């Protein structure tokens, strides 16, 4: 069938995360009974806050990506109030949650995390994509402990022989080259390998390798990178330490920034990369409690679980503010491009 998937094809279950433009929810598709994560984006808020172009860019990027260590897009659609993104549901939740439970991850587990994510990053680069927000909050586990990159909210397409200067990222994960105010400058894919490093170090240690905050001035940060020596606890293997160090090269040109740099790294001579890609190397034991749990809380929100939830056809328009809104909403409705991977899959076998 060539029928369009829309919001009525799903049943909405528990909310699992929050956004300035709407929630993330668990949904079940009615027909297949398959469960997904769905990101709401309020059209009005998006228009008022000039996010519409970013939402479209993200959808466009996600439509052209598929990889075992990404949280992949399956459907997009809209109704009158919202735009929707339906993507893989990762039942283990994010890594931040476990760090917040004071979990320290075993060296071997982190090695295997790096292997999986490095295949994702390399794939992103081959597709000309910088993610720009790699960090524990944005890396999700499946039920077997494999790790996956999500939240492409600030991901950018970088055309060949171009560079990017705009400051966008989470500051304690952002690479030194992102802060340099030298007029002849820029950054590239290598920044995602830096933040992978910061992320791996953080998983091993419990804390980040640099003290940087979201409030810290750019000048202090440049100073922090230039005058701090990262502490590498003696308990760690020289192999891991020397991996972390190639990810945390302040000079992007000397940093690992490619799948092959890691494939050829001695520490990694025991890795079967076909097995990694096929999800046959389980990283390791993962604590029972992840961010999805239904351990009872006093959250006023969602203790009301038992409850269940000819005016636009006039073409109304009142003031300049309300008329501009309508023009933009009209434009959203008309420009939005439905994506459906099932259909792309079916029409590949034809």
Is 22 assigned a ligand-binding role in the annotation? yes
Stretch(es) of the chain classified as CATH 3.30.200.20: 1-91+308-350
Start-to-end CA span in the chain (Å): 13
Distant-in-sequence, close-in-space partners of 106: CB < 8 Å, separation ≥ 6: 284, 285
Multiple choice CATH, 1-91+308-350, 2.60.40.1080, 3.40.1180.10, 3.30.200.20, 3.40.718.10: 3.30.200.20
Q: Find out whether 290 and 97 touch, Cβ atoms under 8 Å.
A: yes
Residue 76: C-alpha distances to residues 93, 144, 208, 232, 251 (Å): 22, 27, 36, 44, 39
Residue 98 DSSP label: H
3-state secondary structure of 75: strand
Distant-in-sequence, close-in-space partners of 298: CB < 8 Å, separation ≥ 6: none
Determine the Cα–Cα distance for residues 191 and 72; give it in Å rounded to an integer: 22
Please, is 301 exposed, middle or buried when counting C-beta atoms within 10 Å of its C-beta (0-12, 13-18, 19+)? exposed
SS (H, E, C) 211-269: CCCCCCCHHHHHHHHHHCCCCCCCCCCHHHHHHHHHHCCCCHHHCCCCHHHHHCCHHHC
Determine the Cα–Cα distance for residues 239 and 177; give it in Å rounded to an integer: 26
Quote the tokens at residue 10.
């799903």
Reported structure resolution in angstroms? 2.3
Q: Parallel, antiparallel, or unpaired: how do β-strands 129-130 and 147-149 relate? A: unpaired
Residue 130: C-alpha distances to residues 13, 120, 127, 188, 222 (Å): 32, 11, 9, 7, 22
3-state secondary structure of 85: strand
Whether 133 sits among the annotated catalytic residues: the reply is: yes
Phi and psi angles of residue 260, each rounded to the nearest 5 degrees, phi first: -70, -35
Quote the tokens at residue 147.
């790790």
| Closest listed residue to residue 188, CA positions, set 135, 121, 255, 252 | 252
Report residue 311 CA to chain centroid gap: 38
Determine the Cα–Cα distance for residues 291 and 136; give it in Å rounded to an integer: 12
Is 229 assigned a ligand-binding role in the annotation? no
Stretch(es) of the chain classified as CATH 1.10.510.10: 92-307
Distant-in-sequence, close-in-space partners of 82: CB < 8 Å, separation ≥ 6: 7, 22, 40, 41, 42, 43
Multiple choice CATH, 92-307, 1.20.1260.10, 2.60.120.260, 1.10.510.10, 3.40.50.300: 1.10.510.10
| Closest listed residue to residue 155, CA positions, set 62, 42, 256 | 62
**Which letter, b or e, does each residue of 106-117 get, where b requires 16 or more Cβ atoms within 10 Å of its Cβ?**
ebebbbbbbbbb
Place of tokens 């000309």: 128
What are the E-state strand segments in the chain? 10-17, 24-29, 35-42, 73-78, 82-88, 93-94, 129-130, 139-141, 147-149, 156-157, 339-340
The technique is X-ray
Among residues 82, 88, 94, 133, the one annotated as catalytic is 133
Is 23 assigned a ligand-binding role in the annotation? yes
């Amino acid at each position: 069938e060539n029928e369009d998937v829309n919001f009525d094809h799903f049943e909405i279950l528990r909310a699992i995360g929050k956004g300035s433009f709407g929630k993330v929810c668990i949904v079940q598709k009615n027909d297949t009974k398959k469960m997904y994560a769905m990101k709401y984006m309020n059209k009005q808020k998006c228009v008022e806050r000039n996010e519409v172009r970013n939402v479209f860019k993200e959808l466009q990027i996600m439509q052209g990506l598929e990889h075992p260590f990404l949280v992949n897009l399956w459907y997009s659609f809209q109704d009158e109030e919202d735009m929707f993104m339906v993507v893989d549901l990762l039942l283990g939740g994010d890594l931040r949650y476990h760090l917040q439970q004071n979990v320290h991850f075993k060296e071997e587990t982190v090695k295997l995390f790096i292997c999986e994510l490095v295949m994702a990053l390399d794939y992103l680069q081959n597709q000309r994509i910088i993610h720009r927000d790699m960090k524990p909050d944005n890396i999700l586990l499946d039920e077997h402990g494999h790790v996956h990159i999500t939240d492409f909210n600030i991901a950018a397409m970088l055309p060949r022989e171009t560079q990017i200067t705009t400051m966008a990222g989470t500051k304690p994960y952002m690479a030194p080259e992102m802060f340099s105010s030298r007029k002849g400058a820029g950054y590239s894919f290598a920044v995602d390998w830096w933040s992978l490093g910061v992320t791996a170090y953080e998983l091993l240690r419990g804390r980040r390798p640099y003290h940087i905050r979201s409030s810290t001035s750019s000048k202090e940060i440049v100073h922090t990178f230039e005058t701090t020596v990262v502490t590498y606890p003696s308990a760690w293997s020289q192999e891991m330490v020397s991996l972390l160090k190639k990810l945390l090269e302040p000079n992007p040109d000397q940093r690992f920034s490619q799948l092959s740099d890691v494939q050829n790294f001695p520490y990694m001579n025991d890795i079967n990369w076909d097995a990694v890609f096929q999800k046959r190397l389980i990283p390791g034991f993962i604590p029972n409690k992840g961010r999805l749990n239904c351990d009872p809380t006093f959250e006023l929100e969602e203790m009301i679980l038992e409850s269940k939830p000819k005016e636009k056809d006039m073409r109304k328009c009142d003031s300049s503010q309300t008329c501009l809104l309508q023009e933009h909403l009209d434009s959203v409705q008309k420009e939005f491009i439905i994506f459906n991977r099932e259909k792309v899959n079916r029409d590949f076998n034809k």
